[PDB]
Design a protein around this motif. Structure first.
Motif, PDB file in Angstrom:
ATOM      1  N   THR A 192     -18.960  24.273  16.181  1.00  0.00           N
ATOM      2  CA  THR A 192     -17.578  24.545  16.220  1.00  0.00           C
ATOM      3  C   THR A 192     -17.190  25.561  16.441  1.00  0.00           C
ATOM      4  OG1 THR A 192     -17.434  22.223  14.369  1.00  0.00           O
ATOM      5  CG2 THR A 192     -15.816  23.444  13.864  1.00  0.00           C
ATOM      6  N   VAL A 193     -16.838  25.867  17.194  1.00  0.00           N
ATOM      7  CA  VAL A 193     -16.747  27.687  16.922  1.00  0.00           C
ATOM      8  C   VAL A 193     -14.949  28.098  17.270  1.00  0.00           C
ATOM      9  CG1 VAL A 193     -16.994  29.765  18.833  1.00  0.00           C
ATOM     10  CG2 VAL A 193     -18.695  27.076  18.934  1.00  0.00           C
ATOM     11  N   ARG A 194     -14.900  29.078  16.571  1.00  0.00           N
ATOM     12  CA  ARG A 194     -13.233  29.229  16.137  1.00  0.00           C
ATOM     13  C   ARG A 194     -12.917  30.777  16.755  1.00  0.00           C
ATOM     14  NH1 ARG A 194     -10.945  26.740  12.218  1.00  0.00           N
ATOM     15  NH2 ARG A 194      -8.892  27.230  12.915  1.00  0.00           N
ATOM     16  N   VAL A 195     -11.824  31.247  17.134  1.00  0.00           N
ATOM     17  CA  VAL A 195     -11.836  32.195  18.387  1.00  0.00           C
ATOM     18  C   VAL A 195     -10.442  32.798  16.983  1.00  0.00           C
ATOM     19  CG1 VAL A 195     -10.850  33.048  20.625  1.00  0.00           C
ATOM     20  CG2 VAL A 195     -12.233  31.227  20.419  1.00  0.00           C
ATOM     21  N   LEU A 196     -11.139  33.895  16.469  1.00  0.00           N
ATOM     22  CA  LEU A 196      -9.492  34.853  16.033  1.00  0.00           C
ATOM     23  C   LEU A 196      -9.531  35.832  16.567  1.00  0.00           C
ATOM     24  CD1 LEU A 196     -10.402  33.684  12.932  1.00  0.00           C
ATOM     25  CD2 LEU A 196      -9.514  31.995  13.713  1.00  0.00           C
ATOM     26  N   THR A 197      -8.615  37.007  16.229  1.00  0.00           N
ATOM     27  CA  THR A 197      -7.800  38.012  17.177  1.00  0.00           C
ATOM     28  C   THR A 197      -8.282  38.697  15.811  1.00  0.00           C
ATOM     29  OG1 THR A 197      -6.603  37.081  18.666  1.00  0.00           O
ATOM     30  CG2 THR A 197      -6.147  39.577  17.620  1.00  0.00           C
TER      31      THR A 197
ATOM     32  N   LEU B 200     -16.354  39.234  23.098  1.00  0.00           N
ATOM     33  CA  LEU B 200     -17.335  38.129  21.510  1.00  0.00           C
ATOM     34  C   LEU B 200     -18.041  38.564  21.334  1.00  0.00           C
ATOM     35  CD1 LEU B 200     -16.989  33.813  22.719  1.00  0.00           C
ATOM     36  CD2 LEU B 200     -15.602  35.582  22.407  1.00  0.00           C
TER      37      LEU B 200
ATOM     38  N   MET C 196     -18.936  34.895   8.388  1.00  0.00           N
ATOM     39  CA  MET C 196     -18.238  34.304   8.450  1.00  0.00           C
ATOM     40  C   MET C 196     -18.836  32.657   9.052  1.00  0.00           C
ATOM     41  SD  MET C 196     -15.700  33.835   7.152  1.00  0.00           S
ATOM     42  CE  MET C 196     -15.389  35.246   6.882  1.00  0.00           C
TER      43      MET C 196
ATOM     44  N   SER D  36     -20.524  29.035   8.736  1.00  0.00           N
ATOM     45  CA  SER D  36     -21.087  27.719   7.877  1.00  0.00           C
ATOM     46  C   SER D  36     -21.948  27.021   8.485  1.00  0.00           C
ATOM     47  CB  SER D  36     -20.273  27.051   6.558  1.00  0.00           C
ATOM     48  OG  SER D  36     -19.308  25.762   7.658  1.00  0.00           O
TER      49      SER D  36
END
Ligand SMILES: [Zn+2]
Ligand SMILES: [Zn+2]
Ligand SMILES: [Zn+2]
Ligand SMILES: [Zn+2]
Ligand SMILES: [Zn+2]
Ligand SMILES: [Zn+2]
Lengths: 89, 364, 131, 89
Positions: free
Chosen positions: C46-51, C90, C96, C98
């Motif tokens: 479940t990877v999340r990509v933020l700035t 990356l 950050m 879980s």
């Protein structure tokens, strides 16, 4: 293994309907003279008769498309104004 | 000398290669203005444009993010100095760059789809046009690495499943790669030249010149060079060593590998290419004959396009006009143009009857 | 927008657009990992990509050792993000996220918030450790 | 094994061409002061000269991009208008 390739960055060239076996204007071959030259010599007298390359990646004998530019303009195998982005194969 | 414009070309080259000359952005504008002013008092613009396009190809087909903003200033100065001619060719080349990046992202998207073969773990394919970009070579067909084999097969299948009619051609004289080697895992770099030799070493070590010349079928011309880029004349970062230490290249010489822990990072590159500007006789004379053929193109096109809406000459009337139109391009070359205008006779298109030099055929 | 005006909540709408970007990239990467999915380390990701500027810096991207099957999962995700989403860097961190640690009389699944993964992995490799 | 990881939910941050080794507006470094500043002191007189972060994830010295906001506006590396989503590294 000892060496494994991770990334690659080839650049891939592409060609339209240049037809390496047949110029689309006179139908002889991509090279090997044209209909307005026939014999290799035929009084060459400098000048030339190689191949012309358009921006739309199409290829013809320089003279065939020069004579076709007196009949029309938009390269015959598309609807884009024919340009001369190259001279020779 | 025509070597002075070739030298302005090499100046542009090393200048943009540094990509840091003059940290102050103001000093950059001034130095560029002085450069174009110096170019203003220069003739033979054809070789200048040829070498500038070659430098564009060298700086765009390599590591990106050089300036990312100065290209607009360069093309604007070209528009304001040369005009809307070879600069329109430059605009076509930038449209080609756009096409390539878009096709690259689209193919990465379509690979996140199938992902059957792991050959394209990380890929970066560029799609350019046989035109804008200068004739690279004879599209070398040397044995290519397998994970790259699978990647190229997937890319070709995709390009033939969608862009039918645009035949693909394989070559080796362009691009780069990142070779993940393995005490740490330091990633090397190969510019599409040492990939095949290193892959043959991975398949079986203890090879020589005969092994890489027999079961690879690679153009000998551009083969000895990459061979020495990997050995002859290397600093203390040698990634491909040999037992017969010698300057000249032999046949029966075994190749080995060394650690060379001097690399203080994980991304160590071997940038033996793009060395000091030598400009050897062969390539230089080849490009010189190419630009002579380009000047032939110029004169012929000028004549066929202008003399169709102008008057006729008797002996030397229209040649003055065709030289004045090309005064700001290069030398008039009277003998060359006189020998070339009399070849059109046996091909029509402004034949110019020599004996009946009183009325020219104003037809097509 | 109706109390303080654009500026702050305008950047907040930009941040919800960044959230849309993250949830589309997560689903896109799961689609990329469907090839040979639920296998090796890339079982459930479940990877999340933020700035950068968008989210507050709680630290400077910590670089401690990462876990077992999770190593293979992160390698697959990084290879995909460098092959398809080539253009960004990356950076790895630990402060950050879980996880769900499947333990094993029944099979009770635990939970680790990206902090106890390394210590528990070192325990799995060899128990009887200390500080 | 005794403990096996089933799910994971890392969040992966990303950076554009911030160039941590050469701010693309002074050609110096993401830090180490700007072209005009250079000398750590040079009469600092409070104020600042750190790093500015855009919405397009690009980074430059606050000074350089503030002096570039007079030459243009839309971040040159892309085409989106430069915003100030951060101050400092
Ligand atoms: Zn023909
Ligand atoms: Zn002909
Ligand atoms: Zn065409
Ligand atoms: Zn700066
Ligand atoms: Zn400053
Ligand atoms: Zn930007």
């Amino acid at each position: 293994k000892r060496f494994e390739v991770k990334k690659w960055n080839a650049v891939a060239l592409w060609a339209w309907d240049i037809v390496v076996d047949n110029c689309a204007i006179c139908r002889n071959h991509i090279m090997d003279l044209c209909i307005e030259c026939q014999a290799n010599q035929a009084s060459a007298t400098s000048e030339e008769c190689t191949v012309a390359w358009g921006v739309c990646n199409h290829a013809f004998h320089f003279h065939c498309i020069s004579r076709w530019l007196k009949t029309r303009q938009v390269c015959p195998l598309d609807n884009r104004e024919w340009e001369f982005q190259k001279y020779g194969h | 000398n025509s070597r002075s414009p070739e030298y302005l070309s090499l100046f542009i080259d090393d200048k943009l290669k540094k990509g840091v000359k003059g940290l102050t952005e103001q000093e950059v504008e001034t130095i560029l203005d002085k450069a174009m002013v110096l170019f203003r008092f220069m003739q033979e613009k054809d070789v200048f444009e040829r070498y500038y396009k070659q430098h564009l190809a060298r700086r765009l087909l390599t590591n990106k993010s050089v300036s990312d903003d100065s290209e607009k200033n360069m093309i604007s100065k070209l528009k304001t100095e040369c005009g809307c001619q070879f600069t329109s060719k430059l605009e076509g080349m930038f449209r080609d760059m756009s096409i390539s990046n878009t096709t690259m992202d689209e193919f990465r998207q379509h690979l996140q789809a199938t992902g059957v073969s792991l050959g394209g773990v990380d890929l970066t394919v560029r799609v350019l046009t046989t035109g804008y970009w200068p004739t690279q070579s004879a599209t070398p067909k040397c044995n290519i690495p397998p994970a790259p084999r699978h990647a190229f097969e997937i890319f070709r299948r995709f390009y033939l499943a969608k862009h039918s009619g645009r035949q693909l051609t394989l070559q080796h004289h362009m691009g780069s790669a990142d070779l993940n080697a393995t005490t740490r895992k330091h990633i090397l770099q190969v510019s599409t030249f040492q990939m095949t030799i290193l892959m043959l070493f991975n398949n079986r070590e203890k090879y020589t010149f005969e092994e890489i010349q027999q079961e690879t079928d690679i153009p000998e011309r551009e083969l000895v060079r990459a061979l020495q880029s990997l050995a002859c004349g290397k600093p203390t970062q040698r990634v491909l060593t040999k037992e017969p230490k010698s300057k000249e290249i032999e046949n029966g010489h075994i190749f080995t590998v060394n650690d060379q822990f001097t690399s203080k990072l994980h991304r160590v590159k071997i940038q033996t290419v793009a060395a000091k500007q030598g400009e050897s006789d062969p390539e230089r004379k080849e490009t010189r004959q190419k630009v002579d053929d380009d000047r032939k193109h110029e004169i012929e096109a000028a004549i066929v396009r202008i003399m169709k809406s102008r008057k006729k000459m008797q002996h030397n009337v229209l040649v003055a006009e065709v030289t004045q139109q090309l005064k700001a391009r290069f030398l008039p070359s009277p003998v060359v143009i006189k020998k070339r205008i009399e070849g059109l006779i046996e091909r029509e298109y402004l034949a110019r009857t020599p004996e009946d030099r009183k009325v020219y055929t104003y037809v097509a």
